[PDB]
Coordinates of C-alpha atoms (C1' of nucleotides) in Angstrom, one line a residue:
Chain A
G12 CA -59.5 39.8 29.9
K13 CA -57.4 43.0 30.0
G14 CA -57.7 46.9 30.9
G15 CA -56.1 47.4 27.4
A16 CA -56.3 51.2 27.5
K17 CA -60.1 50.7 27.3
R18 CA -62.2 53.9 26.5
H19 CA -66.0 53.7 26.5
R20 CA -68.2 56.2 24.4
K21 CA -71.8 55.2 23.3
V22 CA -74.7 57.3 22.0
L23 CA -77.9 58.1 23.9
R24 CA -79.2 61.7 23.1
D25 CA -80.5 61.3 19.5
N26 CA -80.5 57.6 19.1
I27 CA -83.8 56.0 20.2
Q28 CA -82.1 54.0 23.1
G29 CA -81.0 57.4 24.7
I30 CA -84.5 59.0 24.8
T31 CA -86.5 58.5 28.0
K32 CA -89.3 55.8 28.3
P33 CA -91.3 57.7 31.0
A34 CA -91.2 60.6 28.4
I35 CA -93.7 58.4 26.5
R36 CA -95.8 57.2 29.4
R37 CA -96.0 60.9 30.4
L38 CA -97.6 61.2 27.0
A39 CA -99.8 58.1 27.3
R40 CA -101.8 59.1 30.4
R41 CA -102.6 62.7 28.9
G42 CA -104.8 60.4 26.9
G43 CA -105.7 58.7 30.0
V44 CA -105.5 55.0 29.3
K45 CA -105.0 52.9 32.5
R46 CA -102.5 50.4 31.1
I47 CA -99.3 50.5 28.9
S48 CA -98.1 47.2 27.1
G49 CA -94.3 46.8 26.7
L50 CA -94.7 45.8 23.1
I51 CA -96.9 48.8 22.3
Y52 CA -94.7 51.8 23.2
Chain B
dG1 C1' -111.6 30.8 34.7
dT2 C1' -106.6 31.3 34.6
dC3 C1' -101.9 33.7 33.9
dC4 C1' -98.8 37.4 33.4
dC5 C1' -98.3 41.3 31.6
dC6 C1' -98.9 46.5 33.4
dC7 C1' -99.4 49.9 37.3
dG8 C1' -97.8 51.7 41.8
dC9 C1' -93.9 52.7 44.6
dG10 C1' -89.4 52.9 46.8
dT11 C1' -84.4 53.8 45.5
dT12 C1' -80.5 54.0 42.3
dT13 C1' -78.4 56.2 38.1
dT14 C1' -78.0 59.6 33.9
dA15 C1' -78.6 63.5 31.6
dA16 C1' -82.0 67.6 30.9
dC17 C1' -81.8 72.4 32.0
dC18 C1' -80.0 77.0 33.2
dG19 C1' -76.6 80.0 33.4
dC20 C1' -72.7 82.2 31.2
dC21 C1' -69.8 83.5 27.6
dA22 C1' -67.5 83.1 22.2
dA23 C1' -67.1 83.0 17.6
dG24 C1' -68.2 82.8 13.2
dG25 C1' -71.5 81.3 9.3
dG26 C1' -75.1 82.7 7.1
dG27 C1' -78.8 85.3 6.6
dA28 C1' -80.4 90.2 5.7
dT29 C1' -79.7 95.0 3.0
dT30 C1' -78.3 97.5 -0.7
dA31 C1' -76.7 99.0 -5.4
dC32 C1' -76.3 98.1 -10.5
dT33 C1' -77.0 96.4 -14.6
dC34 C1' -78.6 93.3 -18.0
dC35 C1' -81.4 89.2 -19.6
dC36 C1' -85.8 87.8 -19.9
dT37 C1' -90.8 88.9 -19.9
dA38 C1' -95.3 90.9 -20.8
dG39 C1' -97.5 93.4 -24.3
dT40 C1' -98.6 94.1 -29.1
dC41 C1' -98.9 93.1 -34.4
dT42 C1' -99.3 89.7 -38.5
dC43 C1' -99.8 85.5 -40.0
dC44 C1' -101.6 80.3 -40.6
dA45 C1' -100.0 77.1 -40.6
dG46 C1' -101.9 74.0 -36.3
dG47 C1' -106.2 72.6 -35.2
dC48 C1' -111.3 71.7 -35.5
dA49 C1' -115.6 69.1 -38.5
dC50 C1' -116.5 66.4 -42.0
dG51 C1' -116.9 64.0 -46.8
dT52 C1' -114.2 60.3 -49.2
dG53 C1' -111.6 56.2 -49.4
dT54 C1' -109.8 50.8 -49.4
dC55 C1' -108.2 47.5 -45.6
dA56 C1' -108.8 44.6 -41.1
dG57 C1' -111.9 41.1 -39.4
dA58 C1' -116.9 39.0 -39.5
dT59 C1' -121.0 37.0 -42.1
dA60 C1' -122.8 34.6 -45.2
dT61 C1' -123.2 32.6 -50.3
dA62 C1' -123.2 30.0 -54.8
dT63 C1' -120.6 25.9 -56.2
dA64 C1' -118.1 21.8 -55.8
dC65 C1' -116.4 17.3 -53.5
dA66 C1' -116.4 13.5 -50.0
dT67 C1' -119.2 10.6 -46.6
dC68 C1' -122.8 8.3 -45.0
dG69 C1' -128.6 7.8 -43.2
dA70 C1' -132.2 6.1 -44.6
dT71 C1' -135.5 4.5 -48.3
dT72 C1' -137.0 1.7 -52.1
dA73 C1' -136.6 -1.4 -56.1
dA74 C1' -134.6 -5.9 -57.1
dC75 C1' -133.1 -10.9 -56.2
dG76 C1' -132.2 -16.0 -53.6
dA77 C1' -135.5 -19.6 -50.7
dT78 C1' -139.0 -20.8 -48.9
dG79 C1' -144.2 -22.0 -45.6
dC80 C1' -148.2 -23.1 -45.1
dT81 C1' -152.3 -22.3 -47.8
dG82 C1' -155.6 -22.9 -51.5
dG83 C1' -157.1 -25.4 -55.8
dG84 C1' -157.4 -29.5 -57.7
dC85 C1' -155.5 -35.1 -59.0
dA86 C1' -154.5 -40.8 -57.8
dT87 C1' -155.8 -44.3 -53.8
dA88 C1' -158.6 -46.4 -49.1

DNA sequence: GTCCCCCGCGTTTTAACCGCCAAGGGGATTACTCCCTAGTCTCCAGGCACGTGTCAGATATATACATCGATTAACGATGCTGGGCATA
């Protein structure tokens, strides 16, 4: 349970976590559906 | 007819975008030579069509052997039935 010279570096440009979820919904409505499931996207 | 997974909406958090400048890898151009190709000739033996041929399977086929199915001729024993013989 220590500071231990901790350095934090994780990867969120390329990797799919990093990309933006609204970026998708932005996409979803152009099609014009009313609803987005969590599972689906 | 029920339940809960999305939309709308306010605020909190991250990283997209723009602007600026640097540096060098890699793509673009050029010049020269030399291997590799199209083009052209001759040749046939590769390839196309077909007659000829004995061998896989498949189908009976004459001949023989083994096993009954069923029929008919032959044999052992009568059963009343018919045709006559001794007694009421």
